[PDB]
Design a protein around this ligand. Structure first.
Ligand SMILES: CC(C)CCC[C@@H](C)[C@H]1CC[C@H]2[C@@H]3CC=C4C[C@@H](OC(=O)CCC(=O)O)CC[C@]4(C)[C@H]3CC[C@]12C
Ligand SMILES: CC(C)CCC[C@@H](C)[C@H]1CC[C@H]2[C@@H]3CC=C4C[C@@H](OC(=O)CCC(=O)O)CC[C@]4(C)[C@H]3CC[C@]12C
Ligand SMILES: CC(C)CCC[C@@H](C)[C@H]1CC[C@H]2[C@@H]3CC=C4C[C@@H](OC(=O)CCC(=O)O)CC[C@]4(C)[C@H]3CC[C@]12C
Ligand SMILES: CC(C)CCC[C@@H](C)[C@H]1CC[C@H]2[C@@H]3CC=C4C[C@@H](OC(=O)CCC(=O)O)CC[C@]4(C)[C@H]3CC[C@]12C
Ligand SMILES: CC(C)CCC[C@@H](C)[C@H]1CC[C@H]2[C@@H]3CC=C4C[C@@H](OC(=O)CCC(=O)O)CC[C@]4(C)[C@H]3CC[C@]12C
Ligand SMILES: CC(C)CCC[C@@H](C)[C@H]1CC[C@H]2[C@@H]3CC=C4C[C@@H](OC(=O)CCC(=O)O)CC[C@]4(C)[C@H]3CC[C@]12C
Ligand SMILES: CC(C)CCC[C@@H](C)[C@H]1CC[C@H]2[C@@H]3CC=C4C[C@@H](OC(=O)CCC(=O)O)CC[C@]4(C)[C@H]3CC[C@]12C
Ligand SMILES: CC(C)CCC[C@@H](C)[C@H]1CC[C@H]2[C@@H]3CC=C4C[C@@H](OC(=O)CCC(=O)O)CC[C@]4(C)[C@H]3CC[C@]12C
Ligand SMILES: CC(C)CCC[C@@H](C)[C@H]1CC[C@H]2[C@@H]3CC=C4C[C@@H](OC(=O)CCC(=O)O)CC[C@]4(C)[C@H]3CC[C@]12C
Ligand SMILES: CC(C)CCC[C@@H](C)[C@H]1CC[C@H]2[C@@H]3CC=C4C[C@@H](OC(=O)CCC(=O)O)CC[C@]4(C)[C@H]3CC[C@]12C
Ligand SMILES: CC(C)CCC[C@@H](C)[C@H]1CC[C@H]2[C@@H]3CC=C4C[C@@H](OC(=O)CCC(=O)O)CC[C@]4(C)[C@H]3CC[C@]12C
Ligand SMILES: CC(C)CCC[C@@H](C)[C@H]1CC[C@H]2[C@@H]3CC=C4C[C@@H](OC(=O)CCC(=O)O)CC[C@]4(C)[C@H]3CC[C@]12C
Ligand SMILES: CCCCCCCCCCCCO[C@@H]1O[C@H](CO)[C@@H](O[C@H]2O[C@H](CO)[C@@H](O)[C@H](O)[C@H]2O)[C@H](O)[C@H]1O
Ligand SMILES: CCCCCCCCCCCCO[C@@H]1O[C@H](CO)[C@@H](O[C@H]2O[C@H](CO)[C@@H](O)[C@H](O)[C@H]2O)[C@H](O)[C@H]1O
Ligand SMILES: CCCCCCCCCCCCO[C@@H]1O[C@H](CO)[C@@H](O[C@H]2O[C@H](CO)[C@@H](O)[C@H](O)[C@H]2O)[C@H](O)[C@H]1O
Ligand SMILES: CCCCCCCCCCCCO[C@@H]1O[C@H](CO)[C@@H](O[C@H]2O[C@H](CO)[C@@H](O)[C@H](O)[C@H]2O)[C@H](O)[C@H]1O
Ligand SMILES: CCCCCCCCCCCCO[C@@H]1O[C@H](CO)[C@@H](O[C@H]2O[C@H](CO)[C@@H](O)[C@H](O)[C@H]2O)[C@H](O)[C@H]1O
Ligand SMILES: CCCCCCCCCCCCO[C@@H]1O[C@H](CO)[C@@H](O[C@H]2O[C@H](CO)[C@@H](O)[C@H](O)[C@H]2O)[C@H](O)[C@H]1O
Lengths: 187, 187, 187, 187, 187, 187
């Protein structure tokens, strides 16, 4: 019950997060590297420490996740276009399209779960403003400073909450589908 | 009475504020971090003080509020599209759409009130040109300077006035709806 | 007489000024703050003096005026769309639309007059290349220098001339309307 | 004779110059102020000398000329739209449109001549790489250096040649019109 | 078997990689040259070492490969447009179009193989964070440092994996075509 | 024979080169002036040497050539639009259009040959990474260094190869036309 409104809410949340990231994410991380001050005098002790502290920026991971999530929708649209171009057998084709969509949404749920787990394990919750690094160029351990940690961690928490809401909606959709539909999709 | 003209005025104000922010807000806060001068010599005493003075910039909050306000309209549009795709029962569907729109506008009023309260409590009215900060990197209290405070506080006051006008229009719409419509929406 | 050609000329002037500002204004004021040199050594004596000399930049005022001027046109378009969606009474509706447009153009003339008066009182005619400032951060009076004053004052004079031409055209339209139409709009 | 092909060539040249300027002009003058080196030590001796050497940049004048030239075409299009909306009298209206277009093209030729004369008198042909300036901030005469003079003067010469070609085409069109058409337009 | 779904998946992968690169590649390599620190004091020892370490950036090669891959599709579209404009002979024309498409896809597979081999031989897998260079401007061997190596090598590995998947799909399509179709295309 | 496929290939090559330049050329030459290091201490010895080494950048010449090449196509399109608006005489008009197109393609071949000769004579093949300059501001001969020479010369070689391919295709088209068509176009 209430499946269509749930799908509508999920689409609204997807559009909301896509617009929010495409508007704000570029500006926050536009000059992250430039605003890096570290207590050191050895040349090259700054770039190595910045790479160690932030190997992959959060914006790249978010963009990658958003682009990867939309691929089943794109392939479904292409398959529907091909089916329309091609045209008792119609009912069989409709059933095949339905089971294809079911498998697509299951794969989308799996991808969302994997992306959420990876984001949780990689970045975490809070962004440390102060970092301690010791690589080959730096003779001893040095203390570097990060710029704007509060905004980064707040936006990361918001992204995690949005991903959790999407996961909950996807689980609700899977529960609406149910064991019989899962078994039918398997066979 | 005069409900349609009030809704037209509200839409005009929304378009006005959206265009104004999308035109001017990026340029004002484009290089806020760069134009930061503080009386200190300790490395890292500038970024921490800037983060303390401005944890979240006003432009991010305004963009977030604008994007959040438009979500009920987007979900209503999607629901209308779904209803059109699906098509005595028509009258019942129209009544359901009407009560859905009523609940949507009530939620929009609540969200606007919450956003206005948060903006008032977080930023306030005036932006202090001079700041005094004392964090761990800075040994003692230091005096930092902010660039272009007058423009920031003027634009913040204008945004507050626009939000107040929108709140007044929303309250007028709720009064036009009235207790009977609220009770019907509840049940 | 010659009312339609006057309105056409006014629209042409509006499009001309909008295109001119949207093309040139961003580049002139793109790096105004960076090109600021002042004879001082006290930290923070530059930002405060720049804020004192230029509290609100001319481009922001021009953009605000242009956006505010177009609001009656937008509300008229929305009202016309609503009237078209809704559809002896037709003649009454047409008369109401005509008087609404008359009131709208009167309000537009008033807004243009107010904006012109504010621009004249705030900025003036010439931009002083050399400024003398004495605020709290600066111990004594200091002499700061402004970059590209000639272009700024020339473009300000051109904007003032365009606003004057628009005001003259609006006054001509009001004279064409006349006392009888004003009295009819009042009642 | 060969009037239509001449008008086609004029339109092609206008599109060519518009595309060329809109593509290249922004990049050449993007950082003209930054690449300014002058043999001086007095603060403020650089901005004043740059303003004296280049009061108005060539790109602003070219953009202003291009925008001003297109205004008669825009007003003619608006008048044609109004005439279409409004609809022996048709022949009179067509004759009025023809004489209006004749007056418009005469005004366009006059504006082009004035703009060409102003460009010739203001900028000239060659851009001096070395400048000598002596204003109030600079105690004595100082020698400043300009960046990329050859490209600026080459593009200025090309713009002058394009303007001359346009003037020649406009004069050919005026000769095709002739004394009888000029007299008819006058009365 | 499963040829159409394979082509759909290949198109989806192409769109995915195109969007991913067009979104992320510009920002990563936006300021690669600026963030270059090398242990040297001789002027010109930095630019030569940067050129030696990175003669051609990865983004240029990826853009070139993507643009080159799409050329057979563009020429096929143009040929189809010409055939549509031009219109037992229809069957012969369809067979000619089919064999033209077969030759086009064979050429596309060859181009993809060549581009993959070139990318593997030129860049490799890992980006060395530390480089040792000795050119004419630098008296002796000097040690330069690269900024953000981990992101560059991760994205390069992802691009290599995407190219491998595309190559596998193209080989599957060629196997579906088969020896008989290859022989028919040859003659 | 094979004229239509040759024209299709020429159009494909034109689109390919236009897309390639519009994508990559801006980024390569975005900050050429900034990354200029020369062994000198006299102020103004850098800008003059940079102007001497690179009077006109390659990107400007390429953009100018591309824009100039497309002008006959634009004028042909405008002439076709005029002919369509205007409408035994039809056959004569078609023959006139054909001979006009022949003259247009001959002029395009001549322009391409001239542009190729100019590019070969001006820039050459290789970009010298090291330059020796001696102008008035510099007391003696000084050694300046160029940034990213390998990419510039590689892209220049690619542009030369593309221009050569276009010239070969144009010569093939002219050979297909032949002496009889040339004589008919002359008279
Ligand atoms: C997104 C891609 C990656 C793998 C794809 C799947 C790979 C294999 C199959 C089996 C195939 O079987 C029929 C249907 C498409 C499907 C589910 C694909 C749907 C689109 C997916 C999820
Ligand atoms: C659809 C519903 C289920 C969404 C619920 C969202 C939660 C997954 C999010 C929302 C707010 C989050 C919390 C916001 C703030 C914090 C404080 C934060 O504390 C620190 O960063 C310091 C201590 C530490 O290192 O853990 C730990 C995570 C936590 C509890 C977060 C855990 C995850 C929460 C509960
Ligand atoms: C914006 C979203 C956030 C919560 C949503 C609401 C969550 C629950 C419901 C109940 C639901 O009941 C039927 C109708 C939609 C509605 C009002 C949703 C409308 C759209 C809202 C306001
Ligand atoms: C639809 C209608 C009801 C909109 C009305 C808008 C008001 C909510 C705004 C418009 C102008 C605002 C005022 C503009 C200027 C100031 C001065 C300002 O003073 C300071 O910043 C220094 C003193 C202090 O710290 O409070 C205090 C807020 C106040 C009164 C503002 C309070 C809120 C006002 C009345
Ligand atoms: C622009 C807005 C700001 C105030 C508005 C006016 C406020 C009140 C009225 C009265 C109202 O009466 C009917 C008609 C619209 C009008 C003129 C509005 C038209 C549009 C205006 C000029
Ligand atoms: C439709 C018609 C009526 C438009 C007419 C436009 C005028 C309103 C503008 C056009 C040119 C302007 C003038 C251009 C130059 C100057 C010099 C300027 O002198 C200075 O800046 C130094 C002296 C001082 O401080 O006043 C004073 C304003 C004035 C006369 C301007 C006054 C306003 C003028 C007449
Ligand atoms: C461009 C504008 C500036 C002045 C305008 C002219 C001002 C006065 C008239 C007289 C008017 O007489 C009828 C026709 C329009 C015309 C030529 C206008 C056409 C459009 C012009 C050339
Ligand atoms: C449609 C036809 C008539 C267009 C013809 C274009 C001319 C108006 C242009 C094209 C090339 C120009 C010439 C190109 C180069 C120079 C050298 C230039 O010499 C200098 O800059 C140094 C000497 C000085 O200070 O005059 C003087 C202008 C001149 C002759 C230019 C004069 C104007 C010319 C002839
Ligand atoms: C991409 C271009 C480069 C070479 C082109 C090929 C060059 C020669 C021929 C032979 C020609 O023979 C018919 C058909 C087009 C084709 C395959 C062309 C198709 C489009 C290709 C692959
Ligand atoms: C459609 C299927 C067949 C795609 C398979 C993709 C492979 C071509 C890619 C995916 C992951 C890649 C591997 C990811 C990581 C590494 C570690 C890497 O190690 C180093 O960089 C250090 C040692 C060295 O210098 O080789 C060597 C390449 C390798 C094995 C890569 C080899 C190529 C792999 C297997
Ligand atoms: C591109 C322009 C520059 C010169 C133009 C040519 C100038 C003169 C003529 C003669 C004219 O004779 C009829 C036909 C157009 C043509 C070829 C023009 C075609 C378009 C061209 C090649
Ligand atoms: C449609 C077909 C005919 C296109 C053929 C393209 C040629 C016009 C291009 C492609 C590769 C080019 C060559 C690539 C590399 C070089 C090395 C280059 O050597 C140097 O830069 C150092 C020596 C010197 O100063 O000449 C001289 C030009 C040359 C032979 C180029 C000459 C022109 C070539 C043959
Ligand atoms: C699509 C699916 C993708 C799956 C992705 C799986 C990625 C797995 C990454 C394994 C990384 C192991 O290395 C891991 O590094 C991270 C961050 O660098 C460390 O993380 C630590 O520092 C970061 C900040 O730097 C803190 O936010 C975090 O709370 C803390 O645990 C982990 O303690 C360590 O375990
Ligand atoms: C969508 C709904 C969102 C609800 C949002 C609720 C946000 C609540 C934030 C609680 C913050 C508590 O911390 C609060 O910090 C702000 C600004 O940092 C302080 O604010 C103080 O400094 C700021 C500038 O920095 C001044 O403009 C302000 O007038 C002054 O009160 C408050 O004195 C303090 O109470
Ligand atoms: C939509 C309607 C808006 C109405 C706007 C009304 C704005 C009123 C602003 C009142 C400002 C009072 O402060 C006013 O500051 C301006 C500029 O800062 C001063 O202006 C002075 O300096 C400026 C440059 O800085 C010169 O160009 C000007 O000629 C000179 O008078 C005035 O002498 C002073 O009176
Ligand atoms: C739409 C029509 C517009 C009409 C525009 C009329 C503008 C008239 C400007 C009058 C300017 C008088 O001041 C004029 O300055 C210019 C450039 O600043 C000087 O010009 C001098 O220097 C410039 C470079 O700086 C050289 O390129 C030029 O060859 C040389 O003559 C003139 O010698 C002087 O006469
Ligand atoms: C469309 C088809 C294009 C075909 C392209 C063919 C390009 C062939 C390039 C030949 C280059 C020979 O020079 C080649 O330089 C590369 C990188 O510069 C060196 O590569 C070496 O350094 C790079 C980084 O700099 C490492 O990532 C790599 O693992 C290592 O081998 C090779 O050891 C050397 O053989
Ligand atoms: C549309 C048609 C356009 C026709 C264009 C005709 C342009 C003619 C330019 C004549 C220039 C004469 O000056 C010419 O300068 C170039 C480059 O500046 C010199 O060129 C020299 O240096 C350049 C780099 O700077 C090398 O790449 C080149 O191999 C070498 O010959 C020539 O040796 C000299 O002859």
């Amino acid at each position: 019950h209430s499946t269509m409104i749930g799908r509508i809410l999920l689409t609204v949340v997807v559009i909301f997060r896509i617009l929010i990231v495409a508007i704000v994410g570029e500006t926050v991380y536009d000059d992250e590297q430039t605003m890096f001050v570290c207590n050191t005098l050895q040349p090259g002790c700054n770039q190595a420490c910045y790479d160690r502290a932030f190997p992959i920026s959060h914006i790249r991971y978010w963009v990658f996740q958003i682009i990867m999530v939309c691929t089943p929708s794109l392939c479904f649209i292409t398959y529907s276009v091909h089916q329309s171009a091609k045209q008792k057998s119609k009912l069989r084709r409709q059933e095949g399209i339905s089971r294809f969509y079911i498998i697509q949404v299951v794969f989308r749920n799996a991808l969302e779960i994997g992306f959420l787990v990876g984001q949780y394990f990689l970045y975490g919750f809070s962004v440390p403003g102060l970092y301690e690094c010791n690589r080959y160029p730096c003779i001893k351990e040095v203390e570097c400073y990060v710029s704007r940690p509060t905004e980064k961690t707040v936006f990361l928490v918001f992204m995690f909450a949005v991903s959790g809401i999407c996961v909950v909606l996807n689980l609700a959709e899977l529960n609406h589908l149910g064991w019989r539909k899962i078994k039918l999709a398997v066979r």
